[PDB]
Write a structure and sequence with these properties.
The structure holds two protein chains of two kinds. Among the domains of chain A are: 82 residues; 76 residues, no CATH class; 137 residues, no CATH class. Helices cover 58% and strands 4% of the residues of chain A. Chain A contains 24 helices and six strands. By secondary structure, chain B is an alpha+beta fold. Chain B has one domain: Alpha-Beta Plaits (2-Layer Sandwich), CATH 3.30.70. In chain B, 11% of the residues lie in helices and 27% in strands. In chain B, the strands form four sheets. In chain B, strands 1-5-11-6-3 form a five-stranded antiparallel β-sheet. Classes of the chains: A mainly alpha, B alpha+beta. At the A-B interface, helix 1 and helix 12 of A face loops of B. The structure holds 2-acetamido-2-deoxy-beta-D-glucopyranose (NAG) and zinc ion. 2-acetamido-2-deoxy-beta-D-glucopyranose binds next to helix 1 of chain B. It is classed as viral protein/inhibitor. The entry lists the keywords viral protein-inhibitor complex. It forms a dimeric assembly. Structure of Bat coronavirus RaTG13 spike receptor-binding domain complexed with its receptor equine ACE2.
Chain lengths: 596, 196
């Protein structure tokens, strides 16, 4: 009975009980999510608090096997997930206070209200109303009062709590032997492994900054192109060498530039490829959509959907008075039970989402052979990355001709591909400097490199320097603008959206070269390439049983993040964008301000 | 008279694998064709004998051992197998002479809230000898520290529940197993196939 002997045996009692308890929690969640009643939300809470109590006991029991006596890395990685306990290391006072701060920020956010100055009796919450203005309005002054009011009325309430939140989180992280709350979050990319696959939490900062500097060229050119196009819409308020005003970017924050498409579309007379009418003419139903998704995964040699997937999924809004959650989710209920919940409509969007969500299911089905504790993505960016590349193939006209939603003589307009790559860039490329800079500010705040006397000051310096976006009204330290975004107010890490996006195109480029794909990357359909499916299964079956560096190399053949596959995806757009901007300034000076 | 195979196969409830039932068959005439030529069985594997030759044979006893396990574990009811069932619940010998029969029993052994009536042994100091049966509930002492009938850090209760739900995957669904074994001793052979 060595320490490893006992810990192995401890983990055998854990898996059989954890599997049972997690399975009941997952089943009760499903009864609630597919039928919102107070009866079912009762069973859910009772079932989830049985699990948490079991987990907390097993967590402190697993600290009885000291990690440094565990040679077998598989046993170690499992024990590692159990010795993370979180905020339970605080005193009763300091942890009760933190939870109450967290609930206050969250509800300040969801009840946040701003009213129209031109009509004080016209008041709006964020998610129905203020977003509607922020995603649709072309009125500089209407966007402005919604943007500024959101941070004055809501963001100013979050400021004293966020200061306290930082302090208690930094204590919680130090009591768990991390440097600060940021270094704590970066531990999700930590990796113990064989020689050459280790990854430190400080490596992530370096790998994020390196990759981003390779993105700066493409983003600058996209930035300058969008800027020159907004001048036509807002001639009074755009400077052709300065930053873009923060309230004109297509949502409450500029997180995505998606909704700038109407204004910045290169060739407006060419419509998007939308096969919705084709699906409706062919009398497709939700059942047919998922059968086509299944067919796609079979075509690359991947498993069928189980007999139970069809019997138990919720693939359409019930509409019989039963109240459901319509957000699309892929459910890994345990014990070979896999389901998808979404309110599918006969649309090319929901067709695409089905392929994406079924990719989540395939991943789950591949790592179900692994121990309970290592059934998850290699790191937090893998799962959605795997999901996103399914939409990439399923949307290509190559694939849309194969399944018959486009005629066999479909002309591929070069003007449509640039329309398409630009729409993709506004979302995928626009968010990347936003995502890195938001997380860089939080990282520096947690390390203490930004004293709270200069929070808001350094937030807009980095916004102007990195993102090329400028505040339209000056903001002193009464503001807490980062907390005006859901993820900051609600205590979620944000860097996953950066790393996922990188991983996304590394995956796609590797399976496309395995499929012997010919042309530009963005035209790749891995369908009917079992060669490519096996390359992907090699990574999927691993779960988080191996360091994410090895899991990554098992599919793309390198141990680290690489943004070059992303840049060749947008390569036809890059060269097209350089040529549009040739007559104008490219970049931005960070000295101009709309308020000046 | 005819052999009571209906009582074992069509029994309403089956034993837990750790306490697998054993029914002795004797002094009767068995038509094995009602079994092999049937289409109700996902597994029908014989080892010491040929199944179609079983109607011409005479044995002194026939044993029918029955229990319930998950589909992914039926694999272990075979000679030279290992794993949690074969090691600690039901062990078949290398020299096994008989047949292993199995069907999916989801319809009768999974129930809505979960069926927890079927148990299994998870820990044991040593592997079972063939056809051995252990039904003790002594605290498994994993470490050097004695347990004194008290569960704790390295002191584990040895029996655990299967949980069968109608919506589990095929691999985790309940399966009923009947293991028929045969033996021909120095004594009257009373269990025979149907005579012409
Ligand atoms: C059990 O009953 C079914 C009919 O209910 C019958 O077809 C089957 O042969 C019976 N099994 C045995 C072993 O007699
Ligand atoms: Zn997803």
């Amino acid at each position: 009975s060595t320490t490893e002997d006992l810990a192995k045996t401890f983990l055998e009692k854990f898996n059989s009980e954890a599997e049972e308890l997690s399975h009941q929690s997952s089943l009760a969640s499903w009864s609630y999510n597919t039928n919102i009643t107070d009866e079912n939300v009762q069973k859910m809470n009772e079932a989830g608090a049985r699990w948490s109590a079991f987990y907390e006991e097993q967590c402190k029991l697993a600290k009885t096997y000291p990690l440094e006596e565990i040679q077998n890395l598989t046993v170690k990685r499992q024990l590692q997930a159990l010795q993370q306990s979180g905020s339970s290391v605080l005193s009763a006072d300091k942890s009760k206070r933190l939870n109450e701060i967290l609930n206050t920020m969250s509800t300040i956010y969801s009840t946040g209200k701003v009213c129209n100055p031109s009509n004080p009796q016209e008041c709006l919450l964020l998610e129905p109303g203020l977003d509607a203005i922020m995603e649709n309005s072309k009125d500089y002054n209407q966007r402005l009062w919604a943007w500024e009011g959101w941070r004055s009325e809501v963001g100013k309430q979050l400021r004293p709590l966020y200061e306290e939140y930082v302090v208690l989180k930094n204590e919680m992280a130090r009591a768990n032997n991390y440097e600060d709350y940021g270094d704590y979050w970066r531990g999700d990319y930590e990796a113990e492994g064989p020689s050459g696959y280790d990854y430190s939490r400080d490596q992530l900062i370096e790998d994020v900054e390196r990759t981003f500097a390779e993105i700066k060229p493409l983003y600058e050119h996209l930035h300058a192109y969008v800027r020159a196009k907004l001048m036509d819409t807002y001639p009074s308020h755009i400077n052709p060498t300065g930053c873009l005003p923060a309230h004109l970017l297509g949502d409450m924050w500029g997180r995505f530039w998606t909704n700038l498409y109407s204004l910045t579309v290169p060739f407006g007379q060419k419509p998007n490829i939308d096969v919705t009418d084709a699906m409706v003419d062919q009398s497709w139903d939700a059942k047919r959509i998922f059968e086509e998704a299944e067919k796609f995964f079979v075509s690359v040699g991947l498993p069928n959907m189980t007999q139970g997937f069809w019997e138990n999924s919720m693939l359409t809004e019930p509409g019989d008075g039963r109240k459901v959650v319509c957000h699309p989710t892929a459910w890994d209920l345990g014990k070979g039970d896999f389901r998808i919940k979404m309110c599918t409509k006969v649309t090319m969007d929901d067709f695409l989402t089905a392929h994406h969500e079924m990719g989540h299911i395939q991943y789950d089905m591949a790592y179900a052979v692994q121990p309970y504790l290592l059934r998850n993505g290699a790191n937090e960016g893998f799962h959605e990355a795997v999901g996103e590349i399914m939409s990439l193939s399923a949307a290509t006209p190559n694939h849309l001709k194969a399944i018959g939603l486009l005629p066999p003589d479909f002309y591929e307009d070069s003007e449509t591909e640039i329309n398409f790559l630009l729409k993709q860039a506004l979302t995928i490329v626009g968010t990347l400097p936003f995502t890195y800079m938001l997380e860089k500010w939080r990282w520096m705040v947690f390390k203490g490199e930004i004293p709270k006397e200069e929070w808001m000051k350094k937030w807009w310096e980095m916004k102007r320097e990195i993102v090329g976006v400028v505040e339209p009204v000056p903001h002193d330290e009464t503001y807490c603008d980062p907390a005006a975004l859901f993820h900051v107010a609600n205590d979620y890490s944000f860097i996953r959206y950066y790393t996922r996006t990188i991983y996304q195109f590394q995956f796609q480029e590797a399976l496309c070269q395995t499929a012997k794909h010919e042309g530009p990357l963005h035209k790749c359909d891995i369908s009917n390439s079992t060669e490519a499916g096996q390359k992907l299964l090699q990574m999927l079956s691993l779960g988080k049983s191996e360091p994410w560096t090895l899991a990554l190399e098992r599919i793309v053949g390198v141990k680290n993040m690489d943004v070059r596959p992303l840049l060749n995806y947008f390569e036809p757009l890059f060269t097209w964008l350089k040529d549009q901007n040739k007559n104008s300034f490219v970049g931005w000076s960070t000295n101009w301000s709309p308020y000046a | 008279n005819l052999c009571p195979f209906g009582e074992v196969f069509n029994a309403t409830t089956f034993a837990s694998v750790y306490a697998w039932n054993r029914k002795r068959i004797s002094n009767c005439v068995a038509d094995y064709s009602v079994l092999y030529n049937s289409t109700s069985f996902s597994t029908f594997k014989c080892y010491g004998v040929s199944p179609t030759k079983l109607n011409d044979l005479c044995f002194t006893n026939v044993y029918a051992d029955s229990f319930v396990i998950t589909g992914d574990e039926v694999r272990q009811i075979a000679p030279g197998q290992t794993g949690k069932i074969a090691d600690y619940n039901y062990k078949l010998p290398d020299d096994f002479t008989g047949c292993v029969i199995a069907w999916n029993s989801k319809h009768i052994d999974a129930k809505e809230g979960g069926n927890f009536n079927y148990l299994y042994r998870l820990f044991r100091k040593a592997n079972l000898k063939p056809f051995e049966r252990d039904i003790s509930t002594e605290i498994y002492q994993a470490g050097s520290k004695p347990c004194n009938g008290q569960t704790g850090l390295n002191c584990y209760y040895p029996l655990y529940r299967y949980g069968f739900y109608p919506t589990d995957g095929v691999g985790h669904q309940p399966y009923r197993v009947v293991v028929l074994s045969f033996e021909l001793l120095n004594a009257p052979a009373t269990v025979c196939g149907p005579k012409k």
